[PDB]
Design a binder for this molecule. Sequence first.
Ligand code: HEM
Ligand code: HEM
Ligand SMILES: Cc1cc(N)nc2cc(-c3cccc(CN)c3)c(F)cc12
Ligand SMILES: Cc1cc(N)nc2cc(-c3cccc(CN)c3)c(F)cc12
Ligand SMILES: C[C@H](O)[C@H](O)[C@H]1CNc2nc(N)[nH]c(=O)c2N1
Ligand SMILES: C[C@H](O)[C@H](O)[C@H]1CNc2nc(N)[nH]c(=O)c2N1
Ligand SMILES: [Cl-]
Ligand SMILES: [Cl-]
Ligand SMILES: [Gd]
Ligand SMILES: [Gd]
Ligand SMILES: [Gd]
Ligand SMILES: [Zn+2]
Lengths: 401, 401
Amino acid sequence: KFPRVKNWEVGSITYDTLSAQAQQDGPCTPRRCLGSLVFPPEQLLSQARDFINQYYSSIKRSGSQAHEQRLQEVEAEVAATGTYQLRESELVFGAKQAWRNAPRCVGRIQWGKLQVFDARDCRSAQEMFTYICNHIKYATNRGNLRSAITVFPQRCPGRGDFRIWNSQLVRYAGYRQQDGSVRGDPANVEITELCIQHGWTPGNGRFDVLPLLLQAPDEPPELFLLPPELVLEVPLEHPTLEWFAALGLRWYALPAVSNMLLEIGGLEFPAAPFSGWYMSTEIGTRNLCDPHRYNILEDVAVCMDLDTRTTSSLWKDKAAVEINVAVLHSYQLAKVTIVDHHAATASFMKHLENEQKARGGCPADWAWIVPPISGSLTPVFHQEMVNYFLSPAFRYQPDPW
Amino acid sequence: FPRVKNWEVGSITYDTLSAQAQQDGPCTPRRCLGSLVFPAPEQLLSQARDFINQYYSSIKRSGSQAHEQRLQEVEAEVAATGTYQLRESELVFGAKQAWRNAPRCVGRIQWGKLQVFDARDCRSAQEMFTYICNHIKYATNRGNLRSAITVFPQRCPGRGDFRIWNSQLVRYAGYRQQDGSVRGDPANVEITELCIQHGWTPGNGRFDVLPLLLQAPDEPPELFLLPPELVLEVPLEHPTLEWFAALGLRWYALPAVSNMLLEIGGLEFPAAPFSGWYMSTEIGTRNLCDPHRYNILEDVAVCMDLDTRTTSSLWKDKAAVEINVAVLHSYQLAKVTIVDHHAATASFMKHLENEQKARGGCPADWAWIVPPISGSLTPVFHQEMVNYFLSPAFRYQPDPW
Ligand code: HEM
Ligand code: HEM
Ligand SMILES: Cc1cc(N)nc2cc(-c3cccc(CN)c3)c(F)cc12
Ligand SMILES: Cc1cc(N)nc2cc(-c3cccc(CN)c3)c(F)cc12
Ligand SMILES: C[C@H](O)[C@H](O)[C@H]1CNc2nc(N)[nH]c(=O)c2N1
Ligand SMILES: C[C@H](O)[C@H](O)[C@H]1CNc2nc(N)[nH]c(=O)c2N1
Ligand SMILES: [Cl-]
Ligand SMILES: [Cl-]
Ligand SMILES: [Gd]
Ligand SMILES: [Gd]
Ligand SMILES: [Gd]
Ligand SMILES: [Zn+2]
């Protein structure tokens, strides 16, 4: 009943007993595995009882007076109002658990160290903007990055929703040409057009920081320029390839995802931006080298005088490694927190072992934990993993249009 | 019907073939186990009926006289004997389909070009040896490798199985050492001990080719030395790192897997070794760099004068790329067929497109199709896939000891 899980580097065997608690049924059946797919009224009370029960076991307080009392108050609150409010500490505990439950996050060794900014008393896009700005400056911290999440008000029936329209707080512009093709980041062509179609004055640049389209309930979104001194960026140079700097590449310091939905105890927060720090392969391999992103691989290989005429020279692999070297070196020189994929996966192995003792397993998504370069050189490659949904959780959600 | 997206391009397709998946995999709606390495006449009849229907579809004769006649003939033979026998052309079609259906094979663009040797009249382990040597000779073809399978007699009531105890026809010994380390290939410690127990006089190099342990029905395994001239090998050198040759590394030309079970229409062939040609990352990344295989990564990085004291220099990634370069250059120099992971994954994308037109889908195991270095530099990384089990099929089976 409990999956046997083997590590093939060492020979060790464990059992994921935690998988027996999974809630939101995933996309797979005995007939066919869909693990590789990117995107797979008083029921509220059931998810609240369960989450409150999680909270008190976490503090060695199950079956104690305050546990009993908190069970009644949510029951009463839902009876009268239909929803309920989370206590401050519960929201902190829920936010950390949702991070701890994220199967595709390799950074979860850090799950206990998270700063939670309670923004549930917010109203209008001007208040949101200041909350976001406090987050960015606290999280950036002059390059000594600190994980943070800002929780805006929980969705309620019969009223609109708080939503940040950008997928991240810092994203670069994507503009077309006299030929369809894109200047800048092609991942952000849609939101770049929704920003121009809302007043913004588009630049002419490859690396123009987009403006925040912030949406207060039942009102049209409102643009906001970000303070340039708040958006910390790292110009990219290579330790030994002097021409690399002249390619003019940059990335931003803070990875801050602003389009996911935080779900705690049956409550839903469609605006709950969280941020950590980058793993270098996210920048160097995916954002810069993906054929549908900045797609720079051949340009670097030409500069390195590599033989791009046959794939068996492994010129793609050689250029990719040096791009990743330049990311790590640039961020370190600028004193901005960054982690390489070897360090990160080794810490995730430690996380798996910790979570085995603490909870009897850990939901992990193999295809996302294994880095996009040098996969079998990291320990997670050789580790079998079980993927399943626990709550609280971060969820994907439709765009607000 | 699962919707499947390619993220590099935007293409969208539905896998209608997956609904035909008969035998069941390890995943459920609760939990995905896709990353696990290892996931009555009436039922024999209903598998055979499905294979016969496949065969007569492929020759454009479904529902024809010959088709119904073959169905009745098979039912009659299962009634009289508890089994049935494949016609030669059914066996050929069956072996090709099994390759076509193999979810973890990136080489399936080639599935129609397969030489099938019918050894179903094989009588002893000695004859079995002669068929195997002829296989190795034909498939190696002096370095211009050809894909081939040899099919030994099917499992049948009243007799034991033919088995090849070796996991591949060509494998290097692994000797447990004085201090408890391993000399040679650690993956082969078990089979190396079995060979010695059965009368083999061991060597003590790191690249000693193992004998074959061949089992005839109801017989102990019998040892056979492969003739030196039949095992083509490739000394490994690097095009620009001249000290690399002094590592003394070698690999063999022919990947010939010999411990899998071939299942066709309910019949099982526990001995049916098959062979193709190597993709360079199997040798360079996995066989040479895996910590639990030859584990040469750190020795190579040190020789390259890389900084091995910090992970962020990416010494592992740089050393691995050069090991793969060495493999490709060495095999091309020796004029032995080999494919790099970029060419192989590009041909697999064409296979997926062929198969979507032909059958409405294609079973594929993303975590095995994506190469173990430079994953997102290949197009298969950005392609969603559906994993399921079709028959005819190659299956894992337990070791005979
Ligand atoms: C502290 C350093 C962190 C690192 C190094 C890290 C690393 C990563 C990486 C590499 C991914 C893969 C995303 C992709 O490649 O598209 C990811 C996903 C994710 N991260 Fe982390 N992250 C960090 C912090 C955080 C924090 C603070 C949170 C939440 C409070 C978080 C929640 C998530 C979630 C929800 C996902 C998507 C996972 C899923 O769908 O299951 N991460 N992370
Ligand atoms: C002609 C060139 C071929 C190439 C380049 C190729 C490539 C590969 C690779 C890279 C793997 C994964 C092995 C690993 O990393 O552990 C694999 C697995 C496999 N291959 Fe191929 N192969 C070829 C020919 C063949 C042939 C001729 C057959 C059978 C007729 C075959 C059947 C299989 C099977 C059964 C597996 C295990 C897959 C599974 O468990 O679903 N391959 N192949
Ligand atoms: C917080 C954080 C840090 C980091 N270093 N990386 C992160 C990546 C994502 C992410 C999750 C799903 C999809 C995508 C885009 N493919 C990104 C994310 F939400 C948060 C991340
Ligand atoms: C035919 C063929 C060619 C090749 N070039 N490679 C092959 C690799 C395997 C294989 C299957 C399961 C596990 C392993 C070891 N990871 C290898 C296999 F069966 C056949 C292969
Ligand atoms: C198709 C495939 O599932 C998709 O490209 C996934 C694979 N693994 C990934 N892993 C990470 N960390 N991030 C990603 O965006 C993806 N993309
Ligand atoms: C546990 C993990 O799934 C395992 O190490 C797999 C991953 N993908 C693989 N892919 C290929 N082609 N070959 C392998 O041996 C493996 N090993
Ligand atoms: Cl990003
Ligand atoms: Cl091999
Ligand atoms: Gd030059
Ligand atoms: Gd040299
Ligand atoms: Gd040495
Ligand atoms: Zn699955």
